[PDB]
Design a protein around this ligand. Sequence first.
Ligand SMILES: OC[C@H]1O[C@H](O[C@@H]2[C@@H](OC[C@H]3O[C@H](OC[C@H]4O[C@H](O)[C@@H](O)[C@@H](O[C@H]5O[C@H](CO)[C@@H](O)[C@H](O)[C@@H]5O[C@H]5O[C@H](CO)[C@@H](O)[C@H](O)[C@@H]5O[C@H]5O[C@H](CO)[C@@H](O)[C@H](O)[C@@H]5O)[C@@H]4O)[C@@H](O)[C@@H](O)[C@@H]3O)O[C@H](CO)[C@@H](O)[C@@H]2O)[C@@H](O)[C@@H](O)[C@@H]1O
Lengths: 207, 235
Amino acid sequence: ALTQPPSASGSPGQSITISCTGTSNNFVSWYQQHAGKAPKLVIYDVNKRPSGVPDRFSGSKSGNTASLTVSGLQTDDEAVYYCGSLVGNWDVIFGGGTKLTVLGQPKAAPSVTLFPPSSEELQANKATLVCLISDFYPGAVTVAWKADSSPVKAGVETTTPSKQSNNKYAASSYLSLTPEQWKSHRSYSCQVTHEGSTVEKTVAPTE
Amino acid sequence: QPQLQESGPTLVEASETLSLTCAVSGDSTAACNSFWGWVRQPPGKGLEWVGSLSHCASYWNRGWTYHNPSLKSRLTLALDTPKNLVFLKLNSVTAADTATYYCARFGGEVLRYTDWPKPAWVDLWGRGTLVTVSSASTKGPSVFPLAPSSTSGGTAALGCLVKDYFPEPVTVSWNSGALTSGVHTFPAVLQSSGLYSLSSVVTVPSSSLGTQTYICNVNHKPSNTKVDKRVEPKS
Ligand SMILES: OC[C@H]1O[C@H](O[C@@H]2[C@@H](OC[C@H]3O[C@H](OC[C@H]4O[C@H](O)[C@@H](O)[C@@H](O[C@H]5O[C@H](CO)[C@@H](O)[C@H](O)[C@@H]5O[C@H]5O[C@H](CO)[C@@H](O)[C@H](O)[C@@H]5O[C@H]5O[C@H](CO)[C@@H](O)[C@H](O)[C@@H]5O)[C@@H]4O)[C@@H](O)[C@@H](O)[C@@H]3O)O[C@H](CO)[C@@H](O)[C@@H]2O)[C@@H](O)[C@@H](O)[C@@H]1O
């Protein structure tokens, strides 16, 4: 599989490189996807540009690592970038995508509020933990959940960050549990990773 | 420049068949320069290759058809070159098939090749069509309070959990629109049950929790439902 970092950022006019490991051949491509729009091919065959793609986009490859470089970032370059490749005889796979932010305001750490299941929802025989994340920039976070100290993967739904009225970003994440498993642990935690920082909030049924 | 335009149903019940048509303009599906196929993208996730095909035969076949191995047992691709149409058929859909489906033209070592053509990259994308897999019927939401504590430096977050409605959209206001500052309503999540949920949150001064009433107003026009839910501090 192809591995991309979740996000990267630079200021207008700077140069930035994002990488993609696992490319074992020269059938490498890169795609630009603006929010709400279809992807667009910007690099093919490691370093070829389709007609109309500015020369400030350039591709390269070293070992099993392909790289896309954008010289002189413009605000229009803000998008999610995917690497693609041929694998096996004739299969196509894509990387997980890198959210590239062109910095237009100070970076801001997120505020995290973790709501336990409401009494009303528990009386309807359901239990949902609500982790609300707000006031961060760039608009890219990783959310992980823990029961006591053990990581939890099943029952998690997370929204893509969307802009607030103050133009910072917010996101939400949900952990769906039965009332029994909510009562059976000592605590639950929502961990939000943003840039080089992780914020964790904890709730307990005995609160 | 060439254009790809998808069409077909955007709501498919679970276990049923998902069928999509793509109309190609400005290029020939009968020419041998490209493969034609599909890429999909679940909401909020990455790109996933579906497959592609070509009707340009070698001397030992009638064409080429490549499938994503995890979809092959359910997947059928087709071309109608006189009408310049690309087809997708996917049986027994589950929630994991909810995605934006993109019609796609593939390039690579296609016109000339050794051993077999290698369509490796998508050089032309359709606009995409979001197909939702859900057996749900129209259903109004259940609204639950996200109560504040009697939270962080003089201000308190509180909100509403809008659960298990169908279809979209739901709109949320606070205090019949009298409270807008510090309000944020989040995008909906499609749960594995086939129903949507979202949350709305507002930050207010903690000193107001005892004197000011906070009510979220949830409007679900598809079911002609409105819900006002009083959000009161925890006890
Ligand atoms: O990237 C795909 C796959 O690659 C790796 O897995 C290996 C792969 O090996 C396939 C095969 O390759 C080599 O043979 C090459 C070809 O030689 C001959 O011309 C002929 O035998 C070919 O057979 C095809 O054609 C005949 C007649 O035309 C058909 O009757 C027959 O069913 C074959 O048809 C398939 O292949 C053609 C292209 O060759 C397609 O156009 C056609 O639509 C059909 O494709 C379907 O089935 C494929 C599986 O066979 C599948 O990949 C497609 O997506 C589609 O569903 C012959 O192909 C030799 O090395 C030979 O020994 C190999 O078997 O597939 C094997 C099974 O998966 C696997 O064991 C090999 O290791 C892996 O990377 C894998 O993960 C990846 O998906």
